[PDB]
GROMACS .gro file of C-alpha atoms in nm:
model
  418
    1UNK     CA    1   0.000   0.000   0.000
    2UNK     CA    2   0.101   0.362  -0.060
    3UNK     CA    3   0.093   0.443   0.312
    4UNK     CA    4   0.332   0.165   0.412
    5UNK     CA    5   0.569   0.276   0.137
    6UNK     CA    6   0.542   0.625   0.285
    7UNK     CA    7   0.602   0.555   0.652
    8UNK     CA    8   0.871   0.298   0.568
    9UNK     CA    9   1.077   0.571   0.400
   10UNK     CA   10   1.091   0.786   0.713
   11UNK     CA   11   1.459   0.838   0.812
   12UNK     CA   12   1.391   1.100   1.076
   13UNK     CA   13   1.069   1.156   1.270
   14UNK     CA   14   1.054   1.400   1.560
   15UNK     CA   15   0.782   1.284   1.798
   16UNK     CA   16   0.700   1.336   2.165
   17UNK     CA   17   0.751   1.021   2.371
   18UNK     CA   18   0.754   1.012   2.750
   19UNK     CA   19   0.749   1.393   2.746
   20UNK     CA   20   1.064   1.428   2.535
   21UNK     CA   21   1.109   1.510   2.167
   22UNK     CA   22   1.294   1.224   2.001
   23UNK     CA   23   1.362   1.050   1.675
   24UNK     CA   24   1.119   0.761   1.637
   25UNK     CA   25   1.218   0.663   1.280
   26UNK     CA   26   1.446   0.388   1.417
   27UNK     CA   27   1.764   0.567   1.296
   28UNK     CA   28   1.858   0.711   1.637
   29UNK     CA   29   1.926   1.078   1.564
   30UNK     CA   30   2.039   1.267   1.874
   31UNK     CA   31   1.778   1.537   1.949
   32UNK     CA   32   1.890   1.812   2.189
   33UNK     CA   33   1.598   2.030   2.295
   34UNK     CA   34   1.679   2.374   2.449
   35UNK     CA   35   1.588   2.399   2.819
   36UNK     CA   36   1.322   2.671   2.762
   37UNK     CA   37   1.157   2.518   2.449
   38UNK     CA   38   0.798   2.421   2.525
   39UNK     CA   39   0.687   2.090   2.377
   40UNK     CA   40   0.342   1.947   2.320
   41UNK     CA   41   0.139   2.260   2.388
   42UNK     CA   42  -0.115   2.237   2.103
   43UNK     CA   43  -0.042   1.912   1.918
   44UNK     CA   44   0.146   1.610   2.052
   45UNK     CA   45   0.458   1.645   1.833
   46UNK     CA   46   0.482   2.025   1.837
   47UNK     CA   47   0.744   2.265   1.970
   48UNK     CA   48   0.739   2.641   2.013
   49UNK     CA   49   1.033   2.872   1.926
   50UNK     CA   50   0.947   3.187   2.125
   51UNK     CA   51   1.227   3.295   2.366
   52UNK     CA   52   1.565   3.425   2.255
   53UNK     CA   53   1.803   3.141   2.187
   54UNK     CA   54   1.538   2.868   2.175
   55UNK     CA   55   1.694   2.586   1.970
   56UNK     CA   56   1.655   2.221   1.891
   57UNK     CA   57   1.969   2.054   1.751
   58UNK     CA   58   1.940   1.722   1.571
   59UNK     CA   59   2.259   1.526   1.504
   60UNK     CA   60   2.195   1.257   1.238
   61UNK     CA   61   2.348   0.912   1.268
   62UNK     CA   62   2.367   0.854   0.891
   63UNK     CA   63   2.570   0.731   0.593
   64UNK     CA   64   2.951   0.764   0.632
   65UNK     CA   65   3.050   0.616   0.289
   66UNK     CA   66   2.885   0.881   0.064
   67UNK     CA   67   3.004   1.232   0.140
   68UNK     CA   68   2.751   1.358  -0.128
   69UNK     CA   69   2.375   1.309  -0.130
   70UNK     CA   70   2.299   0.984  -0.313
   71UNK     CA   71   1.922   0.955  -0.288
   72UNK     CA   72   1.605   1.157  -0.333
   73UNK     CA   73   1.440   1.289  -0.017
   74UNK     CA   74   1.144   1.481   0.116
   75UNK     CA   75   1.089   1.698   0.422
   76UNK     CA   76   0.747   1.763   0.579
   77UNK     CA   77   0.617   1.954   0.880
   78UNK     CA   78   0.341   2.194   0.980
   79UNK     CA   79   0.423   2.552   1.080
   80UNK     CA   80   0.232   2.832   1.251
   81UNK     CA   81   0.390   3.178   1.250
   82UNK     CA   82   0.275   3.456   1.484
   83UNK     CA   83   0.140   3.789   1.356
   84UNK     CA   84   0.429   3.980   1.518
   85UNK     CA   85   0.692   3.763   1.346
   86UNK     CA   86   0.499   3.786   1.017
   87UNK     CA   87   0.471   4.164   1.036
   88UNK     CA   88   0.848   4.209   1.045
   89UNK     CA   89   1.027   4.321   0.727
   90UNK     CA   90   1.335   4.136   0.865
   91UNK     CA   91   1.468   3.797   0.765
   92UNK     CA   92   1.474   3.504   1.015
   93UNK     CA   93   1.636   3.166   0.960
   94UNK     CA   94   1.423   2.900   1.118
   95UNK     CA   95   1.569   2.563   1.011
   96UNK     CA   96   1.923   2.512   0.887
   97UNK     CA   97   2.145   2.220   0.786
   98UNK     CA   98   2.419   2.433   0.631
   99UNK     CA   99   2.737   2.392   0.836
  100UNK     CA  100   2.992   2.511   0.583
  101UNK     CA  101   2.877   2.547   0.223
  102UNK     CA  102   2.608   2.300   0.129
  103UNK     CA  103   2.273   2.209   0.275
  104UNK     CA  104   1.926   2.355   0.300
  105UNK     CA  105   1.750   2.609   0.519
  106UNK     CA  106   1.405   2.751   0.587
  107UNK     CA  107   1.370   3.127   0.618
  108UNK     CA  108   1.089   3.370   0.696
  109UNK     CA  109   1.087   3.723   0.557
  110UNK     CA  110   0.806   3.975   0.513
  111UNK     CA  111   0.522   3.723   0.537
  112UNK     CA  112   0.701   3.475   0.314
  113UNK     CA  113   0.862   3.137   0.380
  114UNK     CA  114   1.160   3.046   0.165
  115UNK     CA  115   1.331   2.713   0.118
  116UNK     CA  116   1.692   2.709   0.000
  117UNK     CA  117   1.908   2.428  -0.136
  118UNK     CA  118   2.277   2.516  -0.167
  119UNK     CA  119   2.572   2.320  -0.306
  120UNK     CA  120   2.939   2.310  -0.200
  121UNK     CA  121   3.007   2.620  -0.420
  122UNK     CA  122   2.712   2.807  -0.259
  123UNK     CA  123   2.517   2.795  -0.583
  124UNK     CA  124   2.155   2.774  -0.466
  125UNK     CA  125   1.794   2.733  -0.573
  126UNK     CA  126   1.505   2.900  -0.391
  127UNK     CA  127   1.131   2.820  -0.345
  128UNK     CA  128   0.907   3.092  -0.195
  129UNK     CA  129   0.548   3.098  -0.070
  130UNK     CA  130   0.358   3.408   0.040
  131UNK     CA  131   0.169   3.266   0.341
  132UNK     CA  132   0.063   3.606   0.482
  133UNK     CA  133  -0.104   3.769   0.178
  134UNK     CA  134  -0.050   4.105   0.356
  135UNK     CA  135  -0.231   3.982   0.671
  136UNK     CA  136  -0.548   3.901   0.490
  137UNK     CA  137  -0.811   3.680   0.663
  138UNK     CA  138  -0.781   3.454   0.352
  139UNK     CA  139  -0.407   3.407   0.427
  140UNK     CA  140  -0.221   3.200   0.686
  141UNK     CA  141  -0.084   3.443   0.944
  142UNK     CA  142  -0.063   3.251   1.272
  143UNK     CA  143  -0.238   2.957   1.105
  144UNK     CA  144  -0.124   2.594   1.092
  145UNK     CA  145  -0.030   2.499   0.736
  146UNK     CA  146   0.133   2.185   0.597
  147UNK     CA  147   0.469   2.228   0.425
  148UNK     CA  148   0.632   1.962   0.207
  149UNK     CA  149   0.963   1.966   0.020
  150UNK     CA  150   1.047   1.690  -0.229
  151UNK     CA  151   1.392   1.643  -0.385
  152UNK     CA  152   1.486   1.468  -0.705
  153UNK     CA  153   1.864   1.508  -0.703
  154UNK     CA  154   1.845   1.433  -1.076
  155UNK     CA  155   1.534   1.641  -1.138
  156UNK     CA  156   1.335   1.905  -0.953
  157UNK     CA  157   1.286   2.036  -0.601
  158UNK     CA  158   0.920   2.109  -0.526
  159UNK     CA  159   0.735   2.309  -0.262
  160UNK     CA  160   0.382   2.203  -0.160
  161UNK     CA  161   0.150   2.381   0.083
  162UNK     CA  162  -0.140   2.167   0.221
  163UNK     CA  163  -0.075   1.912  -0.057
  164UNK     CA  164  -0.089   2.169  -0.341
  165UNK     CA  165   0.217   2.227  -0.555
  166UNK     CA  166   0.329   2.591  -0.536
  167UNK     CA  167   0.679   2.614  -0.688
  168UNK     CA  168   0.938   2.392  -0.864
  169UNK     CA  169   1.309   2.453  -0.934
  170UNK     CA  170   1.552   2.230  -1.114
  171UNK     CA  171   1.828   2.106  -0.881
  172UNK     CA  172   1.985   1.851  -1.119
  173UNK     CA  173   2.210   2.137  -1.230
  174UNK     CA  174   2.362   2.196  -0.883
  175UNK     CA  175   2.702   2.052  -0.806
  176UNK     CA  176   2.777   1.842  -0.496
  177UNK     CA  177   2.545   1.867  -0.194
  178UNK     CA  178   2.686   1.688   0.111
  179UNK     CA  179   2.475   1.463   0.332
  180UNK     CA  180   2.325   1.650   0.626
  181UNK     CA  181   2.491   1.589   0.962
  182UNK     CA  182   2.325   1.849   1.184
  183UNK     CA  183   1.988   2.024   1.162
  184UNK     CA  184   1.931   2.332   1.375
  185UNK     CA  185   1.585   2.463   1.456
  186UNK     CA  186   1.592   2.816   1.599
  187UNK     CA  187   1.626   3.184   1.524
  188UNK     CA  188   1.961   3.354   1.581
  189UNK     CA  189   1.847   3.703   1.482
  190UNK     CA  190   1.740   3.932   1.767
  191UNK     CA  191   1.364   3.890   1.832
  192UNK     CA  192   1.101   4.099   2.013
  193UNK     CA  193   0.833   3.984   2.255
  194UNK     CA  194   0.548   3.797   2.090
  195UNK     CA  195   0.765   3.695   1.793
  196UNK     CA  196   0.708   3.321   1.802
  197UNK     CA  197   0.631   3.020   1.584
  198UNK     CA  198   0.533   2.656   1.624
  199UNK     CA  199   0.645   2.354   1.421
  200UNK     CA  200   0.483   2.003   1.441
  201UNK     CA  201   0.532   1.654   1.295
  202UNK     CA  202   0.878   1.716   1.145
  203UNK     CA  203   0.978   1.426   0.917
  204UNK     CA  204   1.240   1.346   0.655
  205UNK     CA  205   1.176   1.068   0.400
  206UNK     CA  206   1.433   0.879   0.188
  207UNK     CA  207   1.230   0.929  -0.131
  208UNK     CA  208   1.067   1.194  -0.345
  209UNK     CA  209   0.705   1.181  -0.231
  210UNK     CA  210   0.440   1.195  -0.502
  211UNK     CA  211   0.159   1.448  -0.476
  212UNK     CA  212  -0.066   1.154  -0.389
  213UNK     CA  213   0.167   1.044  -0.109
  214UNK     CA  214   0.182   1.401   0.025
  215UNK     CA  215  -0.196   1.429   0.044
  216UNK     CA  216  -0.203   1.104   0.241
  217UNK     CA  217   0.040   1.245   0.499
  218UNK     CA  218  -0.151   1.574   0.503
  219UNK     CA  219  -0.489   1.409   0.563
  220UNK     CA  220  -0.344   1.179   0.827
  221UNK     CA  221  -0.177   1.455   1.027
  222UNK     CA  222  -0.461   1.707   1.011
  223UNK     CA  223  -0.664   1.482   1.246
  224UNK     CA  224  -0.990   1.474   1.041
  225UNK     CA  225  -1.223   1.411   1.336
  226UNK     CA  226  -1.086   1.684   1.565
  227UNK     CA  227  -1.277   2.010   1.520
  228UNK     CA  228  -1.044   2.304   1.455
  229UNK     CA  229  -1.038   2.664   1.570
  230UNK     CA  230  -0.963   2.948   1.325
  231UNK     CA  231  -0.591   2.902   1.364
  232UNK     CA  232  -0.599   2.529   1.299
  233UNK     CA  233  -0.558   2.435   1.666
  234UNK     CA  234  -0.786   2.170   1.812
  235UNK     CA  235  -1.116   2.322   1.927
  236UNK     CA  236  -1.159   2.277   2.304
  237UNK     CA  237  -1.440   2.279   2.558
  238UNK     CA  238  -1.441   2.549   2.827
  239UNK     CA  239  -1.253   2.792   2.601
  240UNK     CA  240  -1.366   3.136   2.481
  241UNK     CA  241  -1.429   3.176   2.106
  242UNK     CA  242  -1.536   3.463   1.889
  243UNK     CA  243  -1.764   3.272   1.644
  244UNK     CA  244  -1.803   3.412   1.295
  245UNK     CA  245  -1.979   3.311   0.975
  246UNK     CA  246  -1.771   3.261   0.660
  247UNK     CA  247  -2.003   3.491   0.460
  248UNK     CA  248  -1.981   3.775   0.715
  249UNK     CA  249  -1.624   3.761   0.847
  250UNK     CA  250  -1.629   4.108   0.999
  251UNK     CA  251  -1.959   4.070   1.189
  252UNK     CA  252  -1.994   3.946   1.545
  253UNK     CA  253  -2.283   3.757   1.706
  254UNK     CA  254  -2.488   3.970   1.947
  255UNK     CA  255  -2.832   3.957   2.112
  256UNK     CA  256  -3.079   4.227   2.005
  257UNK     CA  257  -3.414   4.208   2.182
  258UNK     CA  258  -3.312   3.850   2.259
  259UNK     CA  259  -3.265   3.749   1.897
  260UNK     CA  260  -2.909   3.673   1.788
  261UNK     CA  261  -2.791   3.884   1.495
  262UNK     CA  262  -2.463   3.971   1.323
  263UNK     CA  263  -2.324   4.317   1.400
  264UNK     CA  264  -2.045   4.465   1.188
  265UNK     CA  265  -1.702   4.505   1.349
  266UNK     CA  266  -1.625   4.872   1.412
  267UNK     CA  267  -1.272   4.784   1.296
  268UNK     CA  268  -1.221   4.491   1.060
  269UNK     CA  269  -0.856   4.465   1.166
  270UNK     CA  270  -0.937   4.370   1.527
  271UNK     CA  271  -1.032   4.001   1.537
  272UNK     CA  272  -1.126   3.982   1.904
  273UNK     CA  273  -1.454   4.174   1.887
  274UNK     CA  274  -1.790   4.059   2.020
  275UNK     CA  275  -1.929   3.836   2.292
  276UNK     CA  276  -1.707   3.536   2.366
  277UNK     CA  277  -1.885   3.201   2.347
  278UNK     CA  278  -1.768   2.909   2.560
  279UNK     CA  279  -1.848   2.551   2.447
  280UNK     CA  280  -1.974   2.305   2.708
  281UNK     CA  281  -1.964   1.921   2.685
  282UNK     CA  282  -2.309   1.761   2.732
  283UNK     CA  283  -2.152   1.413   2.809
  284UNK     CA  284  -1.916   1.561   3.068
  285UNK     CA  285  -1.585   1.512   2.889
  286UNK     CA  286  -1.278   1.636   3.077
  287UNK     CA  287  -1.229   2.010   3.121
  288UNK     CA  288  -1.067   2.168   2.814
  289UNK     CA  289  -1.081   1.838   2.625
  290UNK     CA  290  -1.077   1.843   2.247
  291UNK     CA  291  -1.407   1.869   2.067
  292UNK     CA  292  -1.465   1.597   1.806
  293UNK     CA  293  -1.696   1.525   1.513
  294UNK     CA  294  -2.016   1.378   1.680
  295UNK     CA  295  -1.986   1.544   2.018
  296UNK     CA  296  -2.302   1.693   2.168
  297UNK     CA  297  -2.228   2.051   2.273
  298UNK     CA  298  -2.391   2.347   2.440
  299UNK     CA  299  -2.300   2.712   2.374
  300UNK     CA  300  -2.273   2.976   2.647
  301UNK     CA  301  -2.245   3.343   2.555
  302UNK     CA  302  -2.084   3.604   2.776
  303UNK     CA  303  -2.289   3.921   2.728
  304UNK     CA  304  -2.228   4.234   2.938
  305UNK     CA  305  -2.052   4.021   3.205
  306UNK     CA  306  -2.332   3.763   3.236
  307UNK     CA  307  -2.349   3.407   3.100
  308UNK     CA  308  -2.641   3.282   2.891
  309UNK     CA  309  -2.720   2.959   2.710
  310UNK     CA  310  -2.780   2.984   2.336
  311UNK     CA  311  -3.103   2.809   2.236
  312UNK     CA  312  -3.306   2.760   1.921
  313UNK     CA  313  -3.635   2.947   1.897
  314UNK     CA  314  -3.936   2.723   1.959
  315UNK     CA  315  -4.130   2.890   1.678
  316UNK     CA  316  -4.033   2.970   1.319
  317UNK     CA  317  -3.935   3.320   1.205
  318UNK     CA  318  -4.269   3.384   1.030
  319UNK     CA  319  -4.624   3.289   1.135
  320UNK     CA  320  -4.810   3.012   1.001
  321UNK     CA  321  -4.835   2.857   1.358
  322UNK     CA  322  -4.654   2.402   1.366
  323UNK     CA  323  -4.399   2.396   1.081
  324UNK     CA  324  -4.255   2.065   0.956
  325UNK     CA  325  -4.121   2.167   0.604
  326UNK     CA  326  -3.880   2.454   0.506
  327UNK     CA  327  -3.879   2.590   0.865
  328UNK     CA  328  -3.635   2.866   0.976
  329UNK     CA  329  -3.570   2.935   1.348
  330UNK     CA  330  -3.387   3.230   1.501
  331UNK     CA  331  -3.151   3.177   1.797
  332UNK     CA  332  -3.204   3.328   2.144
  333UNK     CA  333  -3.050   3.343   2.492
  334UNK     CA  334  -3.176   3.206   2.820
  335UNK     CA  335  -3.026   3.259   3.164
  336UNK     CA  336  -3.124   2.916   3.295
  337UNK     CA  337  -2.823   2.694   3.230
  338UNK     CA  338  -2.875   2.318   3.197
  339UNK     CA  339  -2.907   2.028   2.949
  340UNK     CA  340  -3.198   2.131   2.728
  341UNK     CA  341  -3.234   1.962   2.390
  342UNK     CA  342  -3.335   2.297   2.242
  343UNK     CA  343  -2.983   2.413   2.322
  344UNK     CA  344  -2.789   2.104   2.219
  345UNK     CA  345  -2.590   2.120   1.895
  346UNK     CA  346  -2.329   1.910   1.716
  347UNK     CA  347  -2.027   2.035   1.517
  348UNK     CA  348  -1.874   1.876   1.204
  349UNK     CA  349  -1.552   1.974   1.027
  350UNK     CA  350  -1.566   2.103   0.672
  351UNK     CA  351  -1.293   1.960   0.450
  352UNK     CA  352  -1.104   2.259   0.313
  353UNK     CA  353  -0.738   2.340   0.255
  354UNK     CA  354  -0.781   2.718   0.278
  355UNK     CA  355  -1.020   2.764   0.574
  356UNK     CA  356  -1.049   2.599   0.919
  357UNK     CA  357  -1.434   2.589   0.955
  358UNK     CA  358  -1.724   2.367   1.058
  359UNK     CA  359  -2.097   2.319   1.026
  360UNK     CA  360  -2.324   2.325   1.331
  361UNK     CA  361  -2.640   2.113   1.350
  362UNK     CA  362  -2.937   2.063   1.577
  363UNK     CA  363  -3.160   1.755   1.589
  364UNK     CA  364  -3.408   1.892   1.844
  365UNK     CA  365  -3.764   1.819   1.714
  366UNK     CA  366  -3.656   1.872   1.354
  367UNK     CA  367  -3.309   1.836   1.193
  368UNK     CA  368  -3.160   2.177   1.124
  369UNK     CA  369  -2.824   2.322   1.022
  370UNK     CA  370  -2.711   2.673   1.129
  371UNK     CA  371  -2.645   2.929   0.858
  372UNK     CA  372  -2.651   3.310   0.829
  373UNK     CA  373  -2.840   3.523   0.579
  374UNK     CA  374  -3.065   3.827   0.573
  375UNK     CA  375  -3.403   3.778   0.748
  376UNK     CA  376  -3.662   3.972   0.946
  377UNK     CA  377  -3.616   3.787   1.275
  378UNK     CA  378  -3.818   4.006   1.516
  379UNK     CA  379  -4.184   3.947   1.594
  380UNK     CA  380  -4.261   4.318   1.637
  381UNK     CA  381  -4.045   4.484   1.370
  382UNK     CA  382  -4.003   4.461   0.991
  383UNK     CA  383  -3.634   4.542   1.021
  384UNK     CA  384  -3.384   4.322   0.837
  385UNK     CA  385  -3.089   4.164   1.015
  386UNK     CA  386  -2.800   3.939   0.917
  387UNK     CA  387  -2.926   3.652   1.125
  388UNK     CA  388  -2.787   3.317   1.233
  389UNK     CA  389  -3.075   3.074   1.188
  390UNK     CA  390  -3.144   2.702   1.218
  391UNK     CA  391  -3.295   2.582   0.891
  392UNK     CA  392  -3.466   2.255   0.798
  393UNK     CA  393  -3.434   2.074   0.465
  394UNK     CA  394  -3.077   2.195   0.426
  395UNK     CA  395  -2.946   1.934   0.181
  396UNK     CA  396  -2.899   2.199  -0.090
  397UNK     CA  397  -2.709   2.421   0.148
  398UNK     CA  398  -2.442   2.171   0.253
  399UNK     CA  399  -2.182   2.334   0.027
  400UNK     CA  400  -2.297   2.690   0.094
  401UNK     CA  401  -2.039   2.912   0.263
  402UNK     CA  402  -2.330   3.065   0.454
  403UNK     CA  403  -2.327   2.744   0.664
  404UNK     CA  404  -1.955   2.756   0.748
  405UNK     CA  405  -1.850   2.882   1.094
  406UNK     CA  406  -1.507   2.965   1.235
  407UNK     CA  407  -1.403   2.977   1.599
  408UNK     CA  408  -1.151   3.248   1.687
  409UNK     CA  409  -0.965   3.187   2.012
  410UNK     CA  410  -0.740   3.438   2.184
  411UNK     CA  411  -0.415   3.285   2.070
  412UNK     CA  412  -0.066   3.372   2.183
  413UNK     CA  413   0.038   3.405   1.818
  414UNK     CA  414  -0.209   3.687   1.755
  415UNK     CA  415  -0.189   3.966   2.011
  416UNK     CA  416  -0.429   4.262   2.020
  417UNK     CA  417  -0.412   4.550   2.269
  418UNK     CA  418  -0.693   4.594   2.530
   0.00000   0.00000   0.00000
C-alpha cells in the first residue's frame, strides 16, 4: 500500500515520547531540545520557538560512505507563524542544515517562507510561498499549514503547501550537496516579545514523495475528526471563542431584543470583537478536552458580564403557527443553564485546505443546520438583520459558505491591545 511505502521511507521523525522530543524513525538521531523550548502545547509532536536562543539541535546518525547526497528525499512539517513575526520586514532563519557550504534552510521574511538548497560552491535554488497575503483573513498568518519539500537530485525540487504544488526549481544542475549531519531549529536574529512560531510533525523521507503520497500524509496529520479553531488548533471545551460566519467575516454575534444577529465590526482589523462564546460538553468530557466530530455541545455566551445559554427558537421566524417543512428558526438566549435539547448542537468539520471551519447542526424536534443570511427575525419589527438561523431541509445548502463557521480563540500568536 502507498501508506506503508510512505512511513517505511521515514529516516527522521521528531515525535513526543515520555514527554521528550525524540527520533522515532528507528535511525537514532540525537535530538537536543533547548531547556526553555515548550513541547506538546497544542499538538502532541509540536514545539514552540518563542524565547531568545530557543533551539533544537538534531545530530543525524547517517551514511559515512557517501560524502555527497545519493538519494532523493522529502521533508514535511506543519508551521504556525505569529502575527508579530509575520509583520516584520526582517529575515529570520528557522531551520538550517548548512554547516559550511552545502545544505538547505528555511527562512521567513516579510510574510514569506523560503526554502533554499545550496551546493558546495554556494550555488543555490530558492522556493518561496507568500503565506501572509499582507495579513489578509484569507491568508495563513498565525495559522497551521502543511509544508512539504520533495527532492529529485536528478530532477526538480518542489514546494507544496497543504498538498498543493506551489513552486518547482531544477536542482539537477547543482554541483555536490553533502549529506546533512546536523539540523538546527531556531532563530539567531534578535527577536522581540510575541515573535514566536510553532512547528509540528517534522519528518524526513528517503524518497521523493508523489503528490498523492503528500496528500495522504496531510490528511493523516490534520486529524480529520478533531474540530479546529480558526488558527488550525484543536477546538476545546471550556474555552472562549469569537464565532463568525464565513459569509460575514467582519460581523460578530450579538443579542438584540433577545434574537441573535450579526453586527459589523467597528474595525475589521481587530479580530477579538464581540461576545465570547464558551463551548460546554453535554456528556461531561474532561475540562478543556478536544471537541470531536459527533460530540453533543452546548453554547454559552458572555454578554455584558453575564453568562447565557444559546437556544433555538421554539417557533419559526414567520407565522403560520406548527412547521414541519422549510422551517427557519432564530436563535435566542436564556439565563437558565442546563441540558436542554433545544440548546444542544453538534459540530462537524468542513474539509477545506484554505479555511479551518465547521458546520453546526441541531436535531431537536426537527433536523436543522445553522447558517446566516438576511431575514426579518423580530416578531414586532419589519427590520432586516444578518441573522444566524437554524434551517430545515438543508441538503442543498451543505456546500454553501453561509453554513460555514469559524471559531476564533485568543491565541498567543495573535496579540491585540486591550
